[PDB]
Amino acid sequence: LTADVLIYDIEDAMNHYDVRSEYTSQLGESLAMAADGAVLAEIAGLCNVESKYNENIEGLGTATVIETTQNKAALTDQVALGKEIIAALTKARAALTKNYVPAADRVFYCDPDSYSAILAALMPNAANYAALIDPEKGSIRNVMGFEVVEVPHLTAGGAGTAREGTTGQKHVFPANKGEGNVKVAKDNVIGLFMHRSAVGTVKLRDLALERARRANFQADQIIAKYAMGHGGLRPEAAGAVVFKVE
Amino acid sequence: LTADVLIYDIEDAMNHYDVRSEYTSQLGESLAMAADGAVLAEIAGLCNVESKYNENIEGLGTATVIETTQNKAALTDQVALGKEIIAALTKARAALTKNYVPAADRVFYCDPDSYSAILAALMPNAANYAALIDPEKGSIRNVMGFEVVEVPHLTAGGAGTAREGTTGQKHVFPANKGEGNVKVAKDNVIGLFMHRSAVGTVKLRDLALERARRANFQADQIIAKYAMGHGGLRPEAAGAVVFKVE
Amino acid sequence: LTADVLIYDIEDAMNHYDVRSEYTSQLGESLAMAADGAVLAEIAGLCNVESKYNENIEGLGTATVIETTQNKAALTDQVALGKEIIAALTKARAALTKNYVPAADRVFYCDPDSYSAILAALMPNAANYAALIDPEKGSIRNVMGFEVVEVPHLTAGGAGTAREGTTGQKHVFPANKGEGNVKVAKDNVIGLFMHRSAVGTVKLRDLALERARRANFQADQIIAKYAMGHGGLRPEAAGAVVFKVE
Amino acid sequence: LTADVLIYDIEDAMNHYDVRSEYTSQLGESLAMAADGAVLAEIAGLCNVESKYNENIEGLGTATVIETTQNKAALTDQVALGKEIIAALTKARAALTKNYVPAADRVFYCDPDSYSAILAALMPNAANYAALIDPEKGSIRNVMGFEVVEVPHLTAGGAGTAREGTTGQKHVFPANKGEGNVKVAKDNVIGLFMHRSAVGTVKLRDLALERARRANFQADQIIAKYAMGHGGLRPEAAGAVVFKVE
Amino acid sequence: LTADVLIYDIEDAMNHYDVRSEYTSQLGESLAMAADGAVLAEIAGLCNVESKYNENIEGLGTATVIETTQNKAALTDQVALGKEIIAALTKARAALTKNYVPAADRVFYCDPDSYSAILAALMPNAANYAALIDPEKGSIRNVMGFEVVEVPHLTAGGAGTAREGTTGQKHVFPANKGEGNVKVAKDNVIGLFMHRSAVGTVKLRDLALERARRANFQADQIIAKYAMGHGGLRPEAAGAVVFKVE
Amino acid sequence: LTADVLIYDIEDAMNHYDVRSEYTSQLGESLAMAADGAVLAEIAGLCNVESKYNENIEGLGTATVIETTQNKAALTDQVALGKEIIAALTKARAALTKNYVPAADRVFYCDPDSYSAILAALMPNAANYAALIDPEKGSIRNVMGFEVVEVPHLTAGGAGTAREGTTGQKHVFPANKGEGNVKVAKDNVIGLFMHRSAVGTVKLRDLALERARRANFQADQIIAKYAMGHGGLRPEAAGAVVFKVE
Amino acid sequence: LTADVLIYDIEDAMNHYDVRSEYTSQLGESLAMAADGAVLAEIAGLCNVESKYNENIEGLGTATVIETTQNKAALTDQVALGKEIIAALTKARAALTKNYVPAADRVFYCDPDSYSAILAALMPNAANYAALIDPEKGSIRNVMGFEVVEVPHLTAGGAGTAREGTTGQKHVFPANKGEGNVKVAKDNVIGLFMHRSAVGTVKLRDLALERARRANFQADQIIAKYAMGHGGLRPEAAGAVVFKVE
Prior knowledge:
Chains A, B, C, D, E, F, G: It is found in: Virion. The structure holds 7 chains of a larger assembly. The first copy, chain A, has 246 residues and is of the alpha+beta class.
């Protein structure tokens, strides 16, 4: 997928990497029951702690530029570097959001709640007032500052449907601009999920651990490359994405 | 039920506890008739005074840690304490608002008028302009500063119905925020009553006597607990709720 | 009737009492009719002056509190005094507004114009734009600062009917609050008249002469009261209401 | 008719009286017709000048005040004087506007255009947008600053019909206040004409020539009045009204 | 026709008169066509020039004043002069706008485009949004500052139809005032054309060449006039109107 | 076509002409793919560079002026020059926008995306919200400052359809004025394309290379022209238009 | 009854009164025990505690004395007060012991065991050695210090029967003196019960709560009393008697 890096910006970042990142989170809950008198029927059950590991898989790829074109056009190298970096940053976006990446990178799907929902097409085909009740459910211990993810098409369709004006979203504004749903900002990214927003904010949904990003490496010294000058400029993806629970 | 402690905040608090709280209120009213001339057929009565008692039931329910995990992870204890307290403070809410609690706590229902209304599902399924007439009726003897209790779903549905804008309540605002009905603030708590608001304000509706709240107690010294280090951390619910009349 | 003393507040007050109040007002009008030149046939008479008298009759109704409960609860006396005074101030309201009082108070009806209108139910059952024409008629010789009297039910119905918003009166506000009709404030009192407002302002409509109000008297010394301590606390109403003409 | 002197205020005033007022106005107009070359058949016509006379009829009608009441109540004289003056100033209004006066004063009717329209009840019963076209017609040779005369009832009905708000006139205001029709101020006087406003402004419509107004005269010296002290206080109307043309 | 001189004010004026005005304008246009290569079949054409003549007609007509009335009333002469001038200035308006004139003056019709449209009644009876597209078509070469001519009736009807308010034109204002259509000012003149506005602005539509206007001439010296003093005051119309093309 | 030169103004201009203009742009892009480990299946590619050529052909055509009219009217020559220049600048517009030109100039069609769309009539006949999604799609890599091209008819129809007011475009304004669509300015040119706007801004869509424009040449010296004085003034078009890709 | 207050003296006295006397006594109890090694157990048992209610009723009997005798004899008042106080203290004795009271006092009967024995005349007519075995039955659990109640007649009869001497009781003493049965003191009160003594001592048999005793009130201010001086002095009994069980 190729667009603006919008999900990563709101996505929580963690380093802690020697080779890779390590984080510790809680699971489960301590619950209660009893009555008046002495004695009572009473039972136990404590919380649990997890330590999860997050690996980074490389999504490389090469580009073989000849010495003749490299010497004839000096600009064609800098344009190649400037393009290949965005192309794989968007390849990272595919992993960061929820898509399929042509380069062999991490392939996960939609932002999870406290649960990983199964990817399924909805019988009713509309995104509407369900975005109002979600960060509203996000008001128990649940902290707001959410982000309802919607596709530019549904954002144009939501602009098409009845709002304050005949145009505009929940905030009366054109699509893919300063996007905003009810009581919080909206994220407009193409080719994504068309369903009710997941429970829990940034911290619960998506986390991005980064060692680095796609690094370029050109090697003029390869058995066939050195004589021709047909040097191989190589993008090499780094930094991973995680879709957390609890 | 698990949500924000919204009803208790507006709910009136009383201490006076040696072991438990004691309060005195009046019942009924004295009224008499007369005519012009002499003599008249005049009969008159008295007002009665009541002294009601409020007991606190315990909603315990332990949780069994293990020495190994307690030593391996130091954080698992403080997190357990901090989550079990919310778990039973929300269990108190279930009693405070009107719900069923898994722990054997005080199980009452809806906020009463000068009368306890029978819990029944309405034939017309809508919460609307009835919130106008209630604190309006709350103007004869009655002081306002009321609190119309509405479910997040009906508050989203009331946002859906015709108001000032296409969304927003009686005060044009997204649900589960700074909620407000006509002339006074609204309370948004999930899984509650869907009917006309009760007569009489906070003082008449709900009162909450508190000795304390859910207190934690860990005992490493039990037969199976001391050798294994499998200590039992125990939530113990305290403080009660009342739904007053007159 | 029982509510807030709203009509008495706007109602004009007169003392002048030795035993009772005395006021002097004018009746009738002088007129003319002539032609040109001489001689003419022209004749008319004088204006008249009245001196009306307003008496006050006691609205009684005892309450016999026992010495035992008096010594048991010291509060039950002050609560009785603070309840019986409101009970008869509202009994006065019934006379002041237009209702039927249980106690022996002066029973009159609706606020009069320059005429006493006969109490009759309207064939058209609505209170609406008729409040616009009335103090409008009170703009010739007459002065405004009127008070259209409406029942909370019709005020909720007037809120229900088409206005600036979907709710609100002639001034967009919930009923039984700071009530206001067109170009002047509204009075919301339950169980009153449902018709066009009377001509003439406060001075012409209702006047309230007061010596005092309901005075409490407890006598422990009665042949059966001194023994049991079953003291009889008796509310006795004072101050009268008049519905004036011209 | 009895109301505020509203028509006289806008009505043009003329004195010039030795015994009565005299004014000179023009009648008719001169026109022209001809074609090219010579010689042509062309006819002639002159303008005419008129000198009209305006007489003032009286409006007497005594009030026989007894010496006993005059001495017992000193106030009854000043009240009589201050009331009989208004009673006949309103009688002048009846003549000034268009009404039948119980006094044998000047009895004329509706404000004329450049023509005196016959008093007839309209088949369509409404006063509406016709008040827009009238001083709009008064924009050619004519000057604005008009006054559409409407009855309080129709002005409440015009408030009842579709305007800017659900209430208010062409200017959104309650009737009998600071009344205003389209582009100019409205006059609200009861019991008047319900038709399209006349052509021509104040100068063309109504003129009020005044020597004086209703003058009071009391004579204690009449054959029966001197002995009884039954003196006759007598109003005497003065100043006339005219409804002009051209 | 008799109204305010509104069309002449915006109408362009030309003098240049020795006896009458002379102006030079262009007709037709020269175009070009070709093909790729050599040689090509290419035809040629010229632009033409015209010198048009505009004559002035005399719309006279006399007014016969008797010596007796001339001496009895001195004001009748100045009034006659002051009326007859407006009478024939409005007679000129009939020619200037598009009407029939009693005094045989120049009788032309509606403002022309680059073409003289045939005077015909429209099948659809409405003047509306077509006034928007006309000076919008006047945006290619065409400079705006146009003048959509509409009848006071259609202006009141256009006020009646749906606009910003329930009244007012394309600019929300009452008829025959500071009239304005879309983008530019409107002209309100009675008894004129009810159709789409002509193409081209003031310079293309109407031009008014003026030597003078209606000149008054009184001759006491006529064979029957000298003895009677029955002198003949005579309006004599001057200055003509033209409805141009190209 | 004949209108205002609106597309050329926003259209990007390039000189660089010796005889004609030369520009260099890049085609295609170089991508990447691979996985973790060693070794991996990995392929390479290159970006291509183009050097396109843009010629200019003359859209000529003559105009024959006779010596007699040239001497009789001096103005007819300057008028001919002033008309024929606009005639062929509008003929250039036909090429610059997308039309058919009478003189054989360069005939191309609609503004291209990164692709040349086939000229076809739409099954749904409307231009609406699709103008919002286009420079919205141009918010990723693409820069805004776009120009949605619409026909005055569809601009009047877009004014006719539901907007902020009953009239006006996406910006509430009349057609053929200061035209503006959503988030950017609109171009109103007659007889153009009725479809979704092309991807890419000015630089990607249309480029106009100019050596000059239509140059006039008059030759009095031709075998038949010299004796008659029937000189031939001939428009000869210059400067070309290109509809770019990538 | 009328004699010496003997039963009340030995009877246990309590207060605790607000208006009523409230005492707390145990109706038995249940307790348990636990063990160690490990291994703690919970104790089971509900404390059987009662809280009983006792109300005091007034015994009355007015006596009216004239002003003349009050002034003639000053001593008659102090004698009356001294006579009436003993009269009702002996009337209280009737309630305290077991008799019938002429005044409206609490009417109970014989001292109960752990049971209320039915008042019945014995077939054998004698009171003898049964008084020995009764506090001897009160030697297992029970503590002595008892009081065998006997009538002066049976005391004289018990003196008459075989003892140490020919006269004297179980302790050789004449009737109505320092009375004593076997092991413990006797009580001589006339008109009481002739049967075996009840089980349980003072605490189990009778308890005497006292708010006060018979209070005297004289009111010279009664409608018939003030003029005559025939003041009414009325005894009003206070303080009740309880006959306990368990």
